Design a binder for this molecule. Structure first.
Ligand code: VYJ
Ligand code: VYJ
Ligand code: VYJ
Length: 127
């Protein structure tokens, strides 16, 4: 049918702060996941029209992708790291909800999720 608009990435009304955990999410976590061999399906919103997936946004009501996460980090959209971590987790969960277990895209998401969790384990202390 029609794609929804992409998620909001800037909000001038939200308060802003720069923290070492948010800097780490952008400069280490997002950077490492972006370069992974399986990252390319997750680098932009699902274009359900072009990909012939008419029921995608009937099922997935909280879409998320790493292009949006990158922009949110750049625009200081997040006040804390947990908000950004939730967005990565939403991205993976959407893939698991929509696709059959064991599909190619699920294996790709599972590999990215494993790497993501390894990097979140090394999240620096707030300081
Ligand atoms: C920016 C580029 O975008 C994409 C491009 C191409 C592409 O090169 N061609 C080539 C082969 C084509 N033929 C048609 C006949 N056919 C039986 C075989 C394939 C299709 C179009 C494919 C998928 C893309 N983009 C995507 N974005 C999120 C997802 C996503 N694909 N996959 C795929 C990525 C690789 C494995 C699955 C999903 C596919 C279906 C449902 C959900 C999801 C999903 O969850 N995600 C996250
Ligand atoms: C947009 C759709 O995308 C793909 C679809 C399918 C597919 O049949 N499903 C998967 C989705 C299934 N749903 C899941 C949700 N549920 C509710 C309903 C059921 C239905 C059927 C397979 C591969 C895809 N996407 C792809 N994108 C680039 C590549 C690519 N496949 N191929 C294959 C395309 C055909 C030959 C090989 C590659 C495979 C391995 C390595 C590289 C490449 C490669 O080079 N390219 C360019
Ligand atoms: C070197 C092996 O290679 C692959 C193997 C297999 C595989 O299990 N077979 C196939 C061979 C079978 N023999 C052959 C004859 N013999 C006598 C008996 C056994 C056994 C079973 C699947 C995909 C492969 N190769 C791949 N190359 C890039 C990509 C890629 N798969 N994935 C998948 C890998 C895991 C996650 C998804 C992609 C899939 C769809 C779209 C894009 C991409 C993508 O982005 N990349 C980077």
């Amino acid at each position: 049918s029609m794609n929804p608009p992409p998620p909001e990435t800037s909000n001038p009304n939200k308060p802003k702060r720069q923290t070492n955990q948010l800097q780490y999410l952008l400069r280490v976590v997002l950077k490492t996941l972006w370069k992974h061999q399986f990252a390319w399906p997750f680098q932009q919103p699902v274009d359900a029209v072009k990909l012939n997936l008419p029921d995608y946004y009937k099922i997935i009501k909280t879409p998320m992708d790493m292009g949006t996460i990158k922009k949110r980090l750049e625009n200081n959209y997040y006040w804390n790291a947990q908000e950004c971590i939730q967005d990565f987790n939403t991205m993976f969960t959407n893939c698991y909800i929509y696709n059959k277990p064991g599909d190619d895209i699920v294996l790709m998401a599972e590999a990215l999720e494993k790497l993501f969790l390894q990097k979140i384990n090394e999240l620096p202390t707030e300081e």
